[PDB]
Amino acid sequence: GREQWASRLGFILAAMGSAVGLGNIWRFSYVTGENGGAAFLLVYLGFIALIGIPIVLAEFTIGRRAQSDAVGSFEKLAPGKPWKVAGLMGVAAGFLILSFYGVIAGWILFYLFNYITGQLWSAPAEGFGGFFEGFIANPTLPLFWQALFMIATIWIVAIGVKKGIERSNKILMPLLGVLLIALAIYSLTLGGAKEGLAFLFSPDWSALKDPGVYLAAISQAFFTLSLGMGALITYGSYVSKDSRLPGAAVSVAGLDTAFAIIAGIMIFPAVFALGLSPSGGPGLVFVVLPDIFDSIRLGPIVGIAFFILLGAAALSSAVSLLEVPVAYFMRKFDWSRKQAAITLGVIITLLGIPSSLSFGVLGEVTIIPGLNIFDSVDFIASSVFLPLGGMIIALFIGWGWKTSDALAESDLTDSVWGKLWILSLRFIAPIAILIVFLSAF
Ligand SMILES: CCCCCCCCCCCCO[C@H]1O[C@H](CO)[C@@H](O[C@H]2O[C@H](CO)[C@@H](O)[C@H](O)[C@H]2O)[C@H](O)[C@H]1O
Ligand SMILES: CCCCCCCCCO[C@@H]1O[C@H](CO)[C@@H](O)[C@H](O)[C@H]1O
Ligand SMILES: CCCCCCCCCO[C@@H]1O[C@H](CO)[C@@H](O)[C@H](O)[C@H]1O
Ligand SMILES: CCCCCCCCCO[C@@H]1O[C@H](CO)[C@@H](O)[C@H](O)[C@H]1O
Ligand SMILES: CCCCCCCCCO[C@@H]1O[C@H](CO)[C@@H](O)[C@H](O)[C@H]1O
Ligand SMILES: N[C@@H](Cc1c[nH]c2ccccc12)C(=O)O
Numbered sequence: 001g002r003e004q005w006a007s008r009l010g011f012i013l014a015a016m017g018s019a020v021g022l023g024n025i026w027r028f029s030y031v032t033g034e035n036g037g038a039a040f041l042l043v044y045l046g047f048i049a050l051i052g053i054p055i056v057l058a059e060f061t062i063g064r065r066a067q068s069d070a071v072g073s074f075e076k077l078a079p080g081k082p083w084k085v086a087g088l089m090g091v092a093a094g095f096l097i098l099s100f101y102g103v104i105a106g107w108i109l110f111y112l113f114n115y116i117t118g119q120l121w122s123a124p125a126e127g128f129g130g131f132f133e134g135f136i137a138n139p140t141l142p143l144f145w146q147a148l149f150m151i152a153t154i155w156i157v158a159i160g161v162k163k164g165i166e167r168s169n170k171i172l173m174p175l176l177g178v179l180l181i182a183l184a185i186y187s188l189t190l191g192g193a194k195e196g197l198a199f200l201f202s203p204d205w206s207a208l209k210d211p212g213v214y215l216a217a218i219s220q221a222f223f224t225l226s227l228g229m230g231a232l233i234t235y236g237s238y239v240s241k242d243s244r245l246p247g248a249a250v251s252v253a254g255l256d257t258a259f260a261i262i263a264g265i266m267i268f269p270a271v272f273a274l275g276l277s278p279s280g281g282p283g284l285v286f287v288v289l290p291d292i293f294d295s296i297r298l299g300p301i302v303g304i305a306f307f308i309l310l311g312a313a314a315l316s317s318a319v320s321l322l323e324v325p326v327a328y329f330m331r332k333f334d335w336s337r338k339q340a341a342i343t344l345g346v347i348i349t350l351l352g353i354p355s356s357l358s359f360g361v362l363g364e365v366t367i368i369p370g371l372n373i374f375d376s377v378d379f380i381a382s383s384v385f386l387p388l389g390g391m392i393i394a395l396f397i398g399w400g401w402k403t404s405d406a407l408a409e410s411d412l413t414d415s416v417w418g419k420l421w422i423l424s425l426r427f428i429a430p431i432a433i434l435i436v437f438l439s440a441f
């Protein structure tokens with residue numbers, strides 16, 4: 001009685017919907033900014049090609065072969081073997097990541113509400129930066145918008161794969177991309193393009209002699225690809241033998257990278273035209289974008305379109321995050337989909353609440369030494385659980401599978417590409433991750 005994608009394009013568009021969201025605009029911007037731009041970018045692009053694409057194909061393959069959740073897939077394919085630690089850790093990463101993802105997405109709804117009610121058309125007296133700061137440090141206001149976003153997320157997951165997840169509006173992601181392209185072109189004309197483009201594309205290798213940069217690059221590569229937690233195993237598990245995995249993996253990574261690159265071309269020349277520091281941290285785009293819209297005559301209209309379209313993208317990504325614990329709990333405890341979605345969704349919302357508060361009244365609390373609550377949850381989930389899970393997933397196919405199976409189940413043959421793929425999983429990817437972990441600690 002397991003669900004399957006009803007439509008032929010269902011799978012690839014769902015995988016794409018999962019990947020493209022806040023990580024491409026909000027996260028990519030502030031992480032690229034605080035790590036120095038171009039050298040970080042190049043390391044990130046390297047990781048996408050050589051680690052991301054293979055491990056994406058790996059998740060797809062595992063999931064389609066087992067037709068089960070992130071944990072169940074490992075149990076089914078290799079019962080009594082330790083590999084399932086990856087999926088157990090992924091379920092946990094799912095709780096953690098969605099708990100703060102819903103907070104940032106709630107910031108998005110707040111901004112959308114303000115544009116719609118005419119509030120952010122001109123600069124507030126305290127300025128766009130002052131407006132943002134006052135919002136997020138408010139103890140309760142961000143929580144209301146967060147709860148609102150999670151309700152929407154819970155509802156789609158409760159509805160089902162076919163009736164909910166698959167039924168996204170197909171025009172919204174391509175509209176977001178076009179708007180991003182148009183906005184990138186516009187910020188190129190604002191006066192900071194020479195400096196913003198040099199920050200973004202002209203490497204300074206001095207930054208690379210910090211091992212923190214490599215780990216930030218790999219974390220962002222996993223995060224943006226919806227990777228390492230079994231989210232793509234899960235989506236893959238709803239897929240029939242009528243699907244071509246390698247093409248999907250490449251398309252997902254290519255398109256996700258296009259979005260991030262254009263987002264960067266929008267943001268950094270804008271950062272530089274405004275005189276701001278690119279190291280501004282998580283609120284970077286919430287401070288920059290409204291400034292950019294304000295300089296356009298029809299800018300309030302652009303603002304409405306942007307926050308709507310990014311909101312829809314954050315929504316499809318959030319749904320894929322919630323789908324991981326939901327799928328697992330449905331199987332493991334015979335919970336109904338609606339019951340799992342509501343229960344886990346509320347729990348994850350509440351878990352999210354101290355991360356929201358860390359931007360204000362809890363700003364001085366640490367968990368991991370020196371890191372506030374938000375930064376700690378993100379570090380653990382994105383920089384520890386995701387790359388480790390990815391490593392185990394890579395080793396699993398690479399060393400725990402017969403090669404003929406690995407290739408057949410992934411729609412590859414023992415050609416140059418199949419060989420390249422297998423080499424990635426056995427050695428390149430898991431060793432690069434190992435070396436990043438060892439060096440960064
Ligand atoms: C986006 C899709 C639509 C969703 C459904 C709409 C339902 C309507 C709910 C809106 C009610 C929220 O009300 C809220 O609005 C104002 C801001 O926007 C707040 O005003 C606030 O603005 C600042 C943020 O920078 C705060 O730090 C201030 O303490 C406060 O003055 C009100 O203190 C609050 O009560
Ligand atoms: C689908 C693609 C959409 C493309 C949109 C690009 C529009 C760029 C607008 O630039 C602005 O136009 C003024 C007049 O040309 C200049 O004086 C001003 O200094 C400049 O900032
Ligand atoms: C959509 C546009 C994409 C093009 C991006 C390429 C920009 C990266 C290089 O920057 C260049 O670095 C040199 C020294 O730092 C400067 O002499 C030069 O003036 C500057 O432009
Ligand atoms: C839309 C895609 C844009 C990506 C462009 C990537 C290449 C830009 C980097 O070139 C820069 O030029 C400098 C000038 O001397 C040199 O220092 C060095 O070669 C490099 O720092
Ligand atoms: C799909 C559409 C995307 C829209 C993004 C591009 C904005 C068009 C620019 O217009 C003009 O830019 C000047 C900038 O200084 C202003 O003088 C002027 O008042 C403003 O109207
Ligand atoms: N990839 C999405 C977020 C996301 C959805 N599902 C995931 C699973 C794991 C890690 C990240 C995600 C983004 O860039 O916004």
Ligand code: NA
Pocket residue numbers: 019020021023024223224225226256
């Ligand atoms: Na992404």
Ligand code: NA
Pocket residue numbers: 016017018019020021312313314315316317318
């Ligand atoms: Na999305």
